[PDB]
């Protein structure tokens, strides 16, 4: 459980276990007086580093929450195809609307 007024509390597994629907709401409901009694082991340097690493894992889980709704993504560019000696490699110019009913 993260406590955003204490910098030593924030870890990646504490951020990732909280949903991104509730991640913003937990930040908006804390106090704004920073406690200096609980310092992060890297200070304010690694605490910002630690907070960014928790969000990126959560949004990949957010895409998995909509994985039934999205199509399987194809490679964007050429040069990446199994049958490359009989067939040229394409990329998809991602302009369509991925949606699955």
């Amino acid at each position: 459980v993260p406590q955003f007024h204490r910098p030593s509390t924030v870890t990646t597994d504490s951020v990732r276990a909280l949903g991104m629907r509730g991640l913003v709401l937990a930040t908006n409901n804390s106090q704004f007086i920073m406690d200096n009694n609980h310092p992060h082991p890297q200070g304010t340097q690694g605490a910002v580093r630690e907070f960014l690493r928790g969000q990126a894992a959560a949004l990949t889980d957010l895409g998995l929450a909509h994985a039934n709704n999205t199509f399987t993504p194809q490679p964007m560019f050429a040069g990446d195809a199994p049958a490359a000696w009989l067939r040229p490699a394409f990329g998809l110019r991602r302009t369509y609307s991925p949606f699955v009913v």
């Binding site: 964007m76 560019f77 110019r93 991602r94």
Partner: peptide
């Protein structure tokens, strides 16, 4: 970058 702009191409539109 190539990898980001081709990925985020629908947002830019």
């Amino acid at each position: 970058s190539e990898h980001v702009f081709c990925a985020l191409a629908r947002l830019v539109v």
